Curated annotation (Swiss-Prot), chain A:
Induction: In response to low temperature. Negatively autoregulated. Induced by cold shock (42 to 15 degrees Celsius) (at protein level). Residues 1-54 are annotated as: Acidic repeat 1 (AR1). One of its GO terms (biological process) is transcription antitermination. GO terms for molecular function: bacterial-type RNA polymerase core enzyme binding; DNA-binding transcription factor activity; nucleotide binding; protein domain specific binding; RNA binding. It is found in: Cytoplasm. The chain holds residues 373 to 492 of 495 of the full protein. The lineage of its organism: Bacteria, Pseudomonadati, Pseudomonadota, Gammaproteobacteria, Enterobacterales. It comes from Escherichia coli (strain K12). Keywords: Cytoplasm, Host-virus interaction, Repeat, Ribosome biogenesis, RNA-binding, Stress response, Transcription, Transcription antitermination, Transcription regulation, Transcription termination. This is Transcription termination/antitermination protein NusA. Belongs to the NusA family. Part of the processive rRNA transcription and antitermination complex (rrnTAC). The complex forms an RNA-chaperone ring around the RNA exit tunnel of RNA polymerase (RNAP). It supports rapid transcription and antitermination of rRNA operons, cotranscriptional rRNA folding, and annealing of distal rRNA regions to allow correct ribosome biogenesis. Participates in both transcription termination and antitermination. Involved in a variety of cellular termination and antitermination processes, such as Rho-dependent transcriptional termination and intrinsic termination. GO terms for cellular component: cytosol; transcription elongation factor complex. Disruption phenotype: Mutants are sensitive to DNA-damaging agents.
From Swiss-Prot, chain B:
It comes from Escherichia coli (strain K12). Homodimer. The RNAP catalytic core consists of 2 alpha, 1 beta, 1 beta' and 1 omega subunit. When a sigma factor is associated with the core the holoenzyme is formed, which can initiate transcription. Both the N- and C-terminus interact with different regions of transcriptional regulator CRP. The rRNA transcription and antitermination complex (rrnTAC) consists of RNAP, NusA, NusB, NusE (rpsJ), NusG, SubB, ribosomal protein S4, DNA and precursor rRNA; S4 is more flexible than other subunits. The N-terminal domain is essential for RNAP assembly and basal transcription, whereas the C-terminal domain is involved in interaction with transcriptional regulators (such as CRP) and with upstream promoter elements. The modification N6-acetyllysine is found at residues 22-23. This is DNA-directed RNA polymerase subunit alpha. Acetylated on Lys-22 and Lys-23 in the presence of glucose. PatZ controls acetylation of Lys-23 but not of Lys-22. (Microbial infection) ADP-ribosylated on both alpha subunits by the phage T4 protein ModA. ADP-ribosylated on only one of the alpha subunits by the phage T4 protein Alt. Belongs to the RNA polymerase alpha chain family. The gene is rpoA. DNA-dependent RNA polymerase (RNAP) catalyzes the transcription of DNA into RNA using the four ribonucleoside triphosphates as substrates. This subunit plays an important role in subunit assembly since its dimerization is the first step in the sequential assembly of subunits to form the holoenzyme. Part of the processive rRNA transcription and antitermination complex (rrnTAC). The complex forms an RNA-chaperone ring around the RNA exit tunnel of RNAP. It supports rapid transcription and antitermination of rRNA operons, cotranscriptional rRNA folding, and annealing of distal rRNA regions to allow correct ribosome biogenesis.
């Protein structure tokens, strides 16, 4: 694949099927499987980074609790609190070290998360 | 401070307290039940 000029997962995911079928030893089923794997790899990479910080996964799930700014969602996700369920399971004591989160604001966010997850 | 104070609180009130998770609420219920007590008396 690298000798045929492919350097990125994006090229393999999006390049016209004809160019991948010009490679010696690739059949239409193997090219389709390679593209599906490349798209799934691209999807997984994006989701992983979005859950690690606050790009999309924690910027929607962890940030569901009213009051969560994007910065706080990334601070929560850096502690492994990636979802609104993960936040509903926390104590105030587990979040007390997050810069900009007061015990009252932590308690309000955990209660908002519990109201949505357990009482919605 | 007392078991009599705890028994008067409802489950919904205890879930509003700071640093009070679903796991700690289940522990409190299981322990009160072992003594024949229930929350909200």
């Amino acid at each position: 694949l690298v000798e045929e000029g492919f350097s990125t997962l994006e090229e393999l995911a999006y390049v016209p099927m004809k160019e991948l079928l010009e490679i010696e030893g690739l059949d239409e089923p193997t090219v389709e499987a390679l593209r599906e794997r490349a798209k799934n790899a691209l999807a997984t990479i994006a989701q992983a980074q979005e859950e690690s910080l606050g790009d999309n996964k924690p910027a929607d799930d962890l940030l569901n609790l009213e009051g969560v700014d994007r910065d706080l969602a990334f601070k929560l996700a850096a502690r492994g609190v990636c979802t609104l369920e993960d936040l509903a399971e926390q104590g105030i004591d587990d979040l007390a070290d997050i810069e900009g989160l007061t015990d009252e604001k932590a308690g309000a966010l955990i209660m908002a998360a519990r109201n949505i997850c357990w009482f919605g | 401070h007392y078991i009599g104070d705890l028994v008067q609180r409802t489950e919904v009130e205890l879930l509003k307290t700071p640093n009070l998770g679903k796991k700690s609420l289940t522990e409190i219920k299981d322990v009160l039940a072992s003594r024949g007590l229930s929350l909200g008396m």
